[PDB]
Design an enzyme around this catalytic site. Structure first.
Site, PDB file in Angstrom:
ATOM      1  N   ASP A   1     -29.835  38.041  56.939  1.00 43.53           N
ATOM      2  CA  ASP A   1     -28.517  37.579  56.553  1.00 43.53           C
ATOM      3  C   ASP A   1     -27.510  38.711  56.712  1.00 43.53           C
ATOM      4  OD1 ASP A   1     -26.480  36.089  55.332  1.00 43.53           O
ATOM      5  OD2 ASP A   1     -27.129  36.792  53.322  1.00 43.53           O
TER       6      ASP A   1
ATOM      7  N   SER B   1     -30.622  39.786  52.815  1.00 40.33           N
ATOM      8  CA  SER B   1     -29.525  40.638  53.254  1.00 40.33           C
ATOM      9  C   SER B   1     -30.056  42.011  53.657  1.00 40.33           C
ATOM     10  CB  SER B   1     -28.501  40.797  52.137  1.00 40.33           C
ATOM     11  OG  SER B   1     -29.071  41.515  51.048  1.00 40.33           O
TER      12      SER B   1
ATOM     13  N   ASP C   1     -26.755  31.883  47.392  1.00 35.82           N
ATOM     14  CA  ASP C   1     -27.234  33.141  46.836  1.00 35.82           C
ATOM     15  C   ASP C   1     -26.741  33.269  45.403  1.00 35.82           C
ATOM     16  OD1 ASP C   1     -28.162  35.699  46.384  1.00 35.82           O
ATOM     17  OD2 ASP C   1     -26.785  36.699  47.764  1.00 35.82           O
TER      18      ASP C   1
ATOM     19  N   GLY D   1     -19.802  35.338  47.438  1.00 33.01           N
ATOM     20  CA  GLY D   1     -19.948  35.595  46.031  1.00 33.01           C
ATOM     21  C   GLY D   1     -19.048  34.714  45.177  1.00 33.01           C
TER      22      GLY D   1
ATOM     23  N   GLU E   1     -21.052  34.583  63.839  1.00 35.01           N
ATOM     24  CA  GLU E   1     -19.930  34.132  63.029  1.00 35.01           C
ATOM     25  C   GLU E   1     -18.629  34.275  63.801  1.00 35.01           C
ATOM     26  OE1 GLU E   1     -19.806  35.938  59.225  1.00 35.01           O
ATOM     27  OE2 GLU E   1     -18.555  34.353  58.366  1.00 35.01           O
TER      28      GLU E   1
HETATM   29 NA    NA Z   1     -26.549  34.339  57.488  1.00 32.42          NA
HETATM   30 ZN   LIG Z   2     -22.496  34.987  54.288  1.00 36.95          ZN
HETATM   31 ZN   LIG Z   3     -20.034  35.477  56.609  1.00 41.54          ZN
END
Ligand code: NA
Ligand SMILES: [Zn+2]
Ligand SMILES: [Zn+2]
Ligand code: NA
Ligand SMILES: [Zn+2]
Ligand SMILES: [Zn+2]
EC number: 4.1.2.13
Lengths: 292, 292
Positions: free
Chosen positions: B82, B49, B240, B166, B134
């Site tokens: 990410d 990230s 993650d 998460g 995305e």
């Molecule tokens: Na990603």
């Molecule tokens: Zn994600």
């Molecule tokens: Zn996402």
């Protein structure tokens, strides 16, 4: 930049200050040590034990240090094998890119220690790498140190003057044989190394206990003994336990105060800061701050 | 070895399996992920990230991965940014040596998402780097996805089909829109990515709760939904949270059971093992085991 260990310690030797030698086992420790050296304008000895090397892989140990050196290219940095136990281990460190190696044969008789040390020196010096050896277990014989150094051509020497590795150093009040240190220094005239030199500062002790830890009555080397050591000729001051206690104190604290916390950064950013501060204070104590 | 993200995901796309994309923030996480890939003979997507890169420094993030790839050169590895949030962030990742970058502009309207994604794609493809984007928040519009992919030239797409990030994914019962996934897949014919794909296995949850942890009623994607996702066309499965929980569980555990323990390796060797096992099992579940 990454340099021979003797480059750093010859300067400390001539100018009469101590350079902290800080053990690391992963990125978090390494990063915090480097930030301390950058903020205190201090040269760095970075050391990795054989166990730390097994844990990281020697390729990662060297690789991470090289990345950190490029990040702070103005800081003199030596990468030191701590308590090498065999010639082959020192040779692997030399080949992997360590710039200083310690061979610990102090448990052998003088002749065998001297022989093994001399062999490591020959190999390491041919590759441009500096060598530390150890004499004494119990305490150093200064005339033995004198001949050892002359015969082996080792770059720096760790003489036993009354320290033990890790916590629980002294069976009571801290004692160091400073007149014996001075004799060794006088007779060898090389950089000298102090093992088992963690002090366990009161603030680090307090953060560890407040976070629920148990130090089991450990006693470090008092700050004044460290300063008197440097005055006696110590130039490399091995420091590990202090770092680990300060780091894990913060890890324990995070775990205690937030049972839902599992973001690693939330554990290890305060751990790094606590470790960094121990290193910075130690660099000031030993006289390496502002020596870049 | 270190390869373009599309090299790994095109194979997964053509053969209909999922490759776990495993986040790391330090050496311990990275080492465990790589030992998993080696022991399951699985390709690796390694993710960092923007927060992780800030924590490590992008030079260390890339540097450590390159060291790990040399340690396991038979394993195909993509190093992926990410949730890149700006062009400049993606550009910095490309310059540092990332082989895949994700630009997340799904919060913009279609036209602005497409414009920023296309700008990232043109920059990254000129540098031989693959790109993820995305679509959806609102679930993806399959017809938008088709045009988005055709016009942006992006290499893989994360479509919103009912997952958040998460812990605390579903405030009730898990549910994913597999009809919409199959349509997106049919219209785009590219590798697809599932975000927020941690399952929180029962054993990992138990370890974390066994160690005094509080997961606050979090719920992940069930293993069967992950498998049905791959059947629907998901080829990259972002993972993650499962890794962090399993890791910190062991850390909390070591802290609880020995208050005098401050050797970092004693905390992080069991943490690494628990994380490696989560990854190994996920690789089996997703179908990437034995695909090397
Ligand atoms: Na990603
Ligand atoms: Zn994600
Ligand atoms: Zn996402
Ligand atoms: Na040493
Ligand atoms: Zn020692
Ligand atoms: Zn020693």
């Amino acid at each position: 930049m990454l340099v021979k260990g003797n480059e750093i310690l010859l300067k400390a030797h001539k100018e009469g200050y101590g350079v902290g030698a800080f053990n690391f086992v992963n990125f978090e420790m390494l990063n915090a040590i480097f930030e301390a050296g950058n903020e205190e304008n201090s040269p760095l000895f970075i050391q990795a034990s054989e166990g730390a090397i097994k844990y990281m892989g020697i390729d990662m140990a060297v690789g991470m240090v090289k990345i950190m050196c490029e990040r702070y290219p103005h800081i003199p940095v030596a990468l030191h094998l701590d308590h090498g136990t065999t010639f082959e281990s020192c040779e692997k460190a030399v080949k992997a890119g360590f710039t200083s190696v310690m061979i610990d044969a102090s448990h052998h008789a003088f002749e065998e220690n001297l022989e093994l040390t001399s062999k490591v020196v020959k190999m390491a010096h041919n590759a441009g790498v500096s060598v530390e050896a150890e004499l004494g277990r119990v305490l150093v014989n200064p005339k033995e140190a004198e001949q050892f150094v002359k015969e082996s051509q080792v770059d720096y020497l760790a003489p036993a003057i009354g320290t033990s590795h890790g916590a629980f150093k002294f069976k009571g009040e801290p004692k160091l044989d400073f007149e014996r240190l001075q004799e060794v220094k006088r007779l060898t005239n090389i950089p000298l190394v102090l093992h088992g030199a963690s002090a366990i500062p009161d603030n680090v002790r307090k953060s560890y206990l407040d976070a629920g830890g148990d130090l089991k009555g450990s006693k470090g080397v008092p700050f004044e003994f460290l300063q008197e050591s440097v005055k006696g000729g110590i130039n490399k001051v091995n420091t590990d336990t202090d770092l680990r206690i300060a780091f894990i104190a913060e890890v324990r604290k995070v775990a205690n105060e937030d049972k839902s916390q599992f973001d690693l950064r939330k554990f290890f950013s305060p751990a790094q800061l606590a470790l960094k501060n121990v290193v910075k204070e130690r660099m000031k104590l030993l006289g390496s701050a502002n020596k870049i």
